[PDB]
Design a protein around this ligand. Structure first.
Ligand code: 2PG
Ligand code: 2PG
Ligand code: MG
Ligand code: MG
Ligand code: MG
Ligand code: MG
Lengths: 436, 436
């Protein structure tokens, strides 16, 4: 029985406050922390910030925390809910808020309780979190499937001072035999990339972005990709490492056009591209580099652009801001055949149950699911257990630098170790890891 | 009773492997992770690395993990040691190794078992870790003392481009009334710093160093310090935030002299400063800026330079590489009146008992003790409980960015909250927090 529900302010990996929730039962105290994105999609569930410019640059979460302590906590405890029944837990939370976007209590108030409940439930059942998550999602556990880690080793877009528009350049060791090996390989490619970057761009370029990747002043995608390929070869893993991209195109989408030089105040408007034109650029890159995944190639509401490109894409097209882990928007993407992979961000929707449903609907539509961190992470490792529980075969949780990233990767190592021969590595079958 | 001792490889904040130990007792599984420094003091206990350049850039810890699983584990379990008796635990580990620098098993094999044992002991006693650590160190617990955080918000030296020789530039909110306020204030100065750095040096500089601070191409100490002061003022905390430095002078010490431009191959040997001259430079910075602490102003064995400077230092002088958390070296520093504060790094010596002894000897000599993280950290939060348990009043665990840093800071928030009026914030008394 849930005897107590408490919330407090803690700091995320960017030094901004976020919500941490603790749920107490006869099994002990279970803690979950809420992550936070930077450029959140317009359709994401509301992250409640205080807006007090005199405190935390106006990013305090005192209101969200109060909503947990003064509203959710009392009601939840008196309700005597069964933490094992995650749907009941979340229906209770969703009803308490009573808004379509969780704007009343705040998604960052609700999620912490939703996640903590699942941890308390795993303990009551006497099974590791990932196993409980497999039960909640009715996922096959014979055997379990470890995910291919997509490591964001190089930053561009608003995450770099160059002209490079594309935001994330990830590496994916799909050729690895195990997750442990994939992680080692990723670390080696990352370190080789870092040394090469420092040598060609200077020590400063060695500094890392929010997610741990380097962010040198790069001008074109070709330059970035060539650097990554050089790192893969220098590390001695050519043939075992593929590339993933997150264009975050919504950030350079203006007047229904795409400005690949948006970081330039005097960008030549006559060089802005239409949906089909930008798509052609992606095809050129896809033909020259081992790119096996492209996220948010087009704006979050430019459905036509997505559908057009998908017709001849040929590789995994991941939807992030387009779907915001929302089943309703996912249904639209499936009907319009806009993509074939969901970037799963639990805090974009607000509850574990809704996130699981988003994943199930995706898998049912033949889509893949890449569980994802947020640019603003914490020491919380829930998504490590979640990606395993969901048997997706693919996760995006940072470069192999900064512990808000390594914490998840390390947790995956422990899960792998614990499962032994009862688990397999998605490898090249990452797209349909759930079907392995 | 300890039934199992196990070690595995996990990744630190830099993406390099490190040792993670788990001790199993009737109370559960207790996990501790070993941190790792970059330019480790020549006198530090030996960190055992595999040296296989084809694996993890030669930084593998397979040998260390094996020493734990194949050597320490069997003998430790058979010994049936009482985890509450930290001395017995460490005397056993030290004896099993048999070397003065822990080079047989590796300090990174021993420390994990040493720390995990303390966690298991606290659980057995059914008390918070910091409480058990207070008991082991015979520290006062009425009331407890929360530390002033020394946040390394800007990097220099080998940790950045430009000619800036000094390595760490930290802010310390001694003017705060609580630790929670200190952290908020610290986070605000940091964000103001990040924004200012990007505006003056560009996005690139905005990226972070290993410990979370910005690392722009700065040429002089005055340049860096002015930037920090501007951030403090822009944040509205002028007068409440002080500055701490870590010169890491050993990195630019050359046969008796110090080269403030060691990053330049054609450095003018005619401008290299002597101990006394370097001292005048510090005095200049001290009078101009609100600096209240200076770490490693001189080389790890340049004793006379320390003694000379200390005669008129007037502020806290911290020994790091000079003392390497080693009671024997601390005794020398005391006799030479070389400094008045110990930077405590548990992995510099290898065991909790020796670290506690180092702190005690320091306090007995009227020295302050600044518990410290390593540049290579993990999701481990042992030092948060340690600094509280030792009642030191000061900790250095990173800038308010990157979760291997926030993990500790967040843990301190939790401890402060839990203690309530049973704890006080060191504030301006950071130097002698143990005397509150
Ligand atoms: O765009 C994304 O996929 C995420 C993480 O890579 O970033 P944010 O959390 O800022 O939405
Ligand atoms: O010099 C220091 O005090 C530490 C942390 O600031 O760095 P390292 O862990 O590399 O010794
Ligand atoms: Mg976004
Ligand atoms: Mg995205
Ligand atoms: Mg050092
Ligand atoms: Mg130092």
């Amino acid at each position: 029985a849930v005897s107590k529900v408490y919330a407090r302010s803690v700091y995320d990996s960017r030094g901004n406050p976020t919500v941490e929730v603790e749920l107490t039962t006869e099994k002990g105290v279970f803690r979950s922390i809420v992550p936070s994105g930077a450029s959140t999609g317009v359709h994401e569930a509301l992250e409640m910030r205080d807006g007090d410019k005199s405190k935390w640059m106006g990013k305090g979460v005192l209101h969200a925390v109060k909503n947990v302590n003064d509203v959710i906590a009392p009601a939840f405890v008196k309700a005597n809910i069964d933490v094992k029944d995650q749907k009941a837990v979340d229906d209770f939370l969703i009803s308490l808020d009573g808004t379509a976007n969780k704007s009343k209590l705040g998604a960052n108030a609700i999620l912490g309780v939703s996640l903590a409940a699942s941890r308390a439930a795993a303990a009551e059942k006497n099974v590791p979190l990932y196993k409980h998550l497999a039960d909640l999602s009715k996922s096959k556990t014979s055997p379990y499937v470890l995910p291919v880690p997509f490591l964001n080793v190089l930053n561009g877009g608003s995450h770099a001072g160059g002209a490079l528009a594309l935001q994330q350049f990830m590496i994916a060791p799909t050729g690895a035999k195990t997750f442990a090996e994939a992680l080692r390989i990723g670390s080696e490619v990352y370190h080789n990339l870092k040394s090469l970057t420092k040598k060609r761009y200077g020590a400063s370029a060695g500094n890392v972005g929010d997610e741990g990747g380097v962010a040198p002043n790069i001008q074109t995608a070709e330059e970035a990709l060539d650097l990554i390929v050089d790192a893969i070869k220098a590390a001695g893993h050519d043939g075992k490492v593929k590339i993933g991209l997150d264009c975050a195109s919504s950030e350079f989408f203006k007047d229904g056009k795409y400005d690949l030089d948006f970081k330039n105040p005097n960008s030549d408007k006559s060089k802005w591209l239409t949906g089909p034109q930008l798509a052609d650029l992606y095809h050129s890159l896809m033909k020259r580099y081992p790119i096996v995944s492209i996220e948010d190639p087009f704006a979050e509401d430019d459905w036509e652009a997505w559908s057009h490109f998908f017709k001849t894409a040929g590789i995994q097209i991941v939807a992030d801001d387009l779907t915001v882990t929302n089943p309703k928007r996912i249904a639209t993407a499936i009907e319009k055949k806009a993509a074939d992979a969901l970037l799963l961000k639990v805090n974009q929707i607000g509850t574990l149950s809704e996130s699981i449903k988003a994943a199930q609907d995706s898998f049912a539509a033949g889509w893949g699911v890449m569980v994802s961190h947020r640019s603003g992470e914490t020491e919380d490792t829930f998504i490590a257990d979640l990606v395993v529980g969901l048997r997706t075969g693919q996760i995006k949780t940072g470069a192999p630098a900064r512990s808000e990233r390594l914490a998840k990767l390390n947790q995956l190592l422990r899960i792998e170790e614990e499962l032994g021969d009862n688990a397999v590595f998605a490898g090249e079958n990452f797209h349909h890891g759930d079907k392995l």
